[PDB]
Amino acid sequence: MTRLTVALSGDCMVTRGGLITSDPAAERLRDLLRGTDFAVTNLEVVPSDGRGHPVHNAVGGGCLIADSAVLDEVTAAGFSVLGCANNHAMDLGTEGVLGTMDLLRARGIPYAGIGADLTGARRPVYADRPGGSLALLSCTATFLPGQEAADPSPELPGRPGLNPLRHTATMQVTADQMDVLRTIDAETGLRARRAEARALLGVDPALLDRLALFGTRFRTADAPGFTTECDPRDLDEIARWVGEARLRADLVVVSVHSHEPGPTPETPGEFLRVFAHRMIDEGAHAVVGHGPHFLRGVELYRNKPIFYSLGNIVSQIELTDRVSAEDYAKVTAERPLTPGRYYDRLSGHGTRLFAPHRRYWQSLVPVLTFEDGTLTAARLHPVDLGFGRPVHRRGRPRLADRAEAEKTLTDVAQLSQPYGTAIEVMDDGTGELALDV
Amino acid sequence: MTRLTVALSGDCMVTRGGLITSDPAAERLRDLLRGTDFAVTNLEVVPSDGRGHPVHNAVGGGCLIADSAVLDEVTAAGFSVLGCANNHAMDLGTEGVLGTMDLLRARGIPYAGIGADLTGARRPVYADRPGGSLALLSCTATFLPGQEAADPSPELPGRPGLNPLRHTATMQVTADQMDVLRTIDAETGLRARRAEARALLGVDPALLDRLALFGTRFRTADAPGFTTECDPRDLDEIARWVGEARLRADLVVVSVHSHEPGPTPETPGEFLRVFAHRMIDEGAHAVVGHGPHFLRGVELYRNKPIFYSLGNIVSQIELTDRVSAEDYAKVTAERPLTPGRYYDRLSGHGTRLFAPHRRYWQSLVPVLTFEDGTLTAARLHPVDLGFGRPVHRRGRPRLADRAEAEKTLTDVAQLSQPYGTAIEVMDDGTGELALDV
Amino acid sequence: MTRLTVALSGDCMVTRGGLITSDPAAERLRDLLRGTDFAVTNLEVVPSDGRGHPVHNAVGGGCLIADSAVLDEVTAAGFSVLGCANNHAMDLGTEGVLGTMDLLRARGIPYAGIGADLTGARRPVYADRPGGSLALLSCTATFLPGQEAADPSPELPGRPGLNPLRHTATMQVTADQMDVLRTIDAETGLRARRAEARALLGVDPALLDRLALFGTRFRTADAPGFTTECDPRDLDEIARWVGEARLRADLVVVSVHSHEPGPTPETPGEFLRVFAHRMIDEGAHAVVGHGPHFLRGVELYRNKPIFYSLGNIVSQIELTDRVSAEDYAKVTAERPLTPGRYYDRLSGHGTRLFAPHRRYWQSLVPVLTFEDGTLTAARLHPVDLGFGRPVHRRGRPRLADRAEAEKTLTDVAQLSQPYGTAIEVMDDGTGELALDV
Amino acid sequence: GCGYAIVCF
Amino acid sequence: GCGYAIVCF
Amino acid sequence: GCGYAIVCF
Amino acid sequence: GCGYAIVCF
Ligand SMILES: [Ca+2]
Ligand SMILES: [Ca+2]
Ligand SMILES: [Ca+2]
């Protein structure tokens, strides 16, 4: 009956024009994206005509702001539905995110994940085509506290911001380790400095056999360990909107931004896996993840795919022309710096950060085919971002050649093996997931 | 030659009209304030006509927003120079603080501590009278990270915000306590989750014999202890502007907001004392502190006074008509709440928070007399905020009657005794500091 | 690997529509410009919808202001990157140059050389195409003092303006000539009128064996002579941005406006040659000059071309419809003048200024080919501007016919001979530089 | 932004 | 806002 | 702003 | 704009 194709991708950190080069492998990527019914990416950059003020985002790597003309590069390349909840959408504050919504709506680009209040950030966006409709929901587990949007009260408006997926981490420690922690709390004088809060609240907010010291949760356990768990409010609220989107579109896609690592850098946080299973339990047809800037595994759960990380589809951080004063201060200089010189110094003249490692310059574009909601095909198109090229050329995407596509498909297979995922490989280096249907 | 009088006060948390009642003791307070050359207070509330969006400030006790008409109550009561750097000036975000600056300038009220960028927040404001001039600088050590203002770069504007006095706390632990902390770091799996940051930065950001675990600084020492120290950039920058103000006014007053407790709730943070000494070293004639909502000691340093905390001069938190949705969520309710009901539930129907304790409803208004920069008199006027009165009446200030003024003057003397400060007491309950001049 | 073509041209003084006529030689010029990857010209006219006020620019020949619709003529003709730093961009003041930036950005035209502050005027603009990117920097050595842009201070904004290349001229005189100059200074009473400045500054600002009289620098030398030298700040600052542009684009082009003559009208100023060598030393791939309204020589320096002057690509000064009152005053008239009559009288009914001489109506459009930054071809296309035609038709460009193209190519060869430049000549009158690669 | 005092109401 | 990973560049 | 050339038309 | 006086502070 209804047959729809969806292209997925990761972080779109675009800061310059000419996104699709004259390379035939790059033009074939645009042809691939244009040929689908819907093409989703995560706008990991603030398009701006000047509205707002830079926030201090040292932990996110600095501000990521670009001329709003980059939005024409995104649409001309083939992307048609935008997820905006990430740790950079608020780089220009509440006024910046209101400016982003204005820019996207004036260009007729559907988006989700940000809004003038919390409900607007949580809502799905519905993209309608002659062949059918797709609902996109977008959330992020990585952001500066306070950047989440807020809903209005009877007396005050809401707050523009992002759709949050909060989570808590608990340290499991032995009883003897717990006793030393409380000993350190008492003997340093730290417990004495909570005496006022004890009188005002009536309780010591550090005794919960839980315990909250140094802004971290500790719990007595038989063996040391580390746990993560999604905020119940965010999980139930996002799931609520997923069930709503299921009634009003053929396909529901949940895009989640998450930098958080599991026990290993390539594994997702345990909470993120619980989140993705819940989204499919509620009716989502796919979960697309991003954040780490490298690829993570792919899981098939109840015959629906979870892409824990598609990495970067566009990577032009080092080419941004808008560096904030607080960002400049992170580099000690004997003379005022130009942006390119600042990024060269920040990376130690290229010897650290993302440039030296190949994992940050390989990507993947899945193309999913659905027939009345059933996944019938999941093609995998490896993407090359130009590792080792000059800074002004690396970061633009093109379909990887045969040899490098095969290495990328091998990585994906190895990263997805713990989930029982198998891949068929074509002669050109592209592949597809082995499905049970 | 030049003789000037300065009235000082603490937190002005005004949310209603009729600030000065028909009580003769309240009208005499207005007469006292009006009779000085300059009257300084800390505007601990966002006056607003609607511009901005509420930020999440749970740690500050919620949002503190009021009708801008309260500014007429502040000036009619006698206050004439306003310090605005505190942990509530950003309760409506960057747009709110820009709206506050607009409101203050349209009413011709001199202010300092906030600005459209960092320099503007650091600048002194110069209040000129026929008898002479006073320079006010205002900073805060308590605020949500990111709320500090930012200066512009060649490519991006600054960020509106407050004048910050940042500080770091270090836990001194024994070597055996340090070994258990690193053991907990390794055995829980926490050290494993920094593996990516180790590759990107080239170092483990937790090994500094310093150490940074759980977002807290640890240092090996012979005995456990607790240290605090001002951020060197903020200390040098604020001191720089103090020396500038010294050249352009008779009197330089530094107002610093600080909730941070010392070893005991009544003692200031060690960093705050270093800050106050530095301000007078640089040429300030007085340092007025606030934040804790109760009184702290008074110190005479190089014949200049340091008031570590003057408490509240106006306390009408529970009467605010603008409660944000995130604030409402902190109280579990079976029905939507009105503001007054919300505050009643938040305080456990009056059995906790500030209402049960008398220290939160006594205040002090010092009146300093300077002659060519030399302190010649420091009168102390105890102020009563109506402990035990109904919520709609407590928080308005009046000169305390004889009996309660004497008890307040005794508290101040006891809180100032560790600094060697002596007080003379008048028959009406007012007093003055014993000076060496 | 990367192969890019760049068309260069001189002053674009366009004031009317129909820039490209139905002449096949003019349509072939548009085809040539459209066929390159980038086409650069110097916008020597203020496009305006009415914003700003005319400045007094008698020395520049009057105001040069046109309907903003001429920008559509510029882009339709094939020009795609605009250099704006010249001695007419400020003809409508700071408000006019802000209006020009608005007009160019609303039409999506990349530009450089002007900005809201000095940094913005110094920045390169990056033009991205599928085949690669070009960075354009634009400066001017000819402008009214004060028209240069200014950067902001902590308390005041910058000033919109142009990117300056300042320079100083020193007169070398014999010791006996120097003694007469100081004698004239003393005996006329001129030295007496600096008595106040001597007391205020503590020195006589005329004794530097340097010497500054009559707003001119004099130096004792063995033989009389004339020297020029670039301002060290401007040279180092422009070079700094050139090195920045080198990191972020394949090709860096520096466009410099300079009317200043050398010992002969056809030779460039000595400072301009030092500037051009420095630009290529810093990494620029080409230096395009303009200003004099006639052609100057071409130099190959380290295998990169320097075009000291490409003259006019469009010359419609006498057709402007917007003549200022101060401009009108330069022509004594017994009745109020219409623009065309004013220009006829100003040129003495065509017997002086630019119309009588053929050098002001020949031009050149170089087309450079680069392969991975190496110059592989430099084609030369002579352009005819219609010498001797009626005023309403001369000034529109077309590819010169064979006979006149040959004469223009001969001029270029003779003007470039002192630099050792050789030219190959085709049968149609076009040519190309002899390269060492 | 209220590290060791926890409460800064 | 990047508790245990420290870096989320 | 046209010191020795005098004319910069 | 301060030809022979040089300084017009
Ligand atoms: Ca991210
Ligand atoms: Ca406070
Ligand atoms: Ca010119």
Short mmCIF file of N, CA and C and ligand atoms in Angstrom, two decimals, chain B residues 11 42 44 86-88 142 257 259 291-293, chain D residues 8-9, ligand 2:
data_model
loop_
_atom_site.label_atom_id
_atom_site.label_comp_id
_atom_site.label_asym_id
_atom_site.label_seq_id
_atom_site.Cartn_x
_atom_site.Cartn_y
_atom_site.Cartn_z
N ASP B 11 19.96 43.24 51.29
CA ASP B 11 19.08 42.81 50.21
C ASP B 11 17.76 43.55 50.24
N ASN B 42 21.09 46.77 47.67
CA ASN B 42 21.26 45.72 46.67
C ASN B 42 19.88 45.32 46.16
N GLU B 44 17.67 43.08 45.04
CA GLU B 44 17.55 41.62 44.97
C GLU B 44 16.16 41.23 44.45
N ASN B 86 23.90 40.14 41.78
CA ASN B 86 23.49 39.15 42.76
C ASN B 86 23.00 37.92 42.00
N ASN B 87 22.49 36.93 42.73
CA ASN B 87 22.07 35.67 42.13
C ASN B 87 20.62 35.69 41.66
N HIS B 88 20.00 36.86 41.55
CA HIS B 88 18.64 36.96 41.03
C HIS B 88 18.49 37.96 39.89
N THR B 142 27.92 34.65 44.16
CA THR B 142 26.87 33.64 44.08
C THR B 142 26.04 33.90 42.83
N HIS B 257 27.93 40.55 46.71
CA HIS B 257 26.92 39.57 47.09
C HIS B 257 27.58 38.21 47.28
N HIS B 259 26.64 34.38 49.29
CA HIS B 259 25.97 33.45 50.18
C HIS B 259 26.94 32.51 50.88
N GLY B 291 23.64 38.81 51.13
CA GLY B 291 23.44 37.48 50.62
C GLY B 291 22.79 36.51 51.59
N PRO B 292 23.41 36.30 52.76
CA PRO B 292 22.94 35.22 53.65
C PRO B 292 21.54 35.41 54.21
N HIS B 293 20.98 36.62 54.16
CA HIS B 293 19.68 37.01 54.73
C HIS B 293 19.74 37.16 56.25
N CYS D 8 21.28 28.36 48.57
CA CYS D 8 21.46 29.81 48.59
C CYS D 8 20.13 30.48 48.21
N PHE D 9 19.15 30.23 49.07
CA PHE D 9 17.83 30.85 48.97
C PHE D 9 17.94 32.33 49.31
CA CA H 2 20.88 36.27 47.16
#
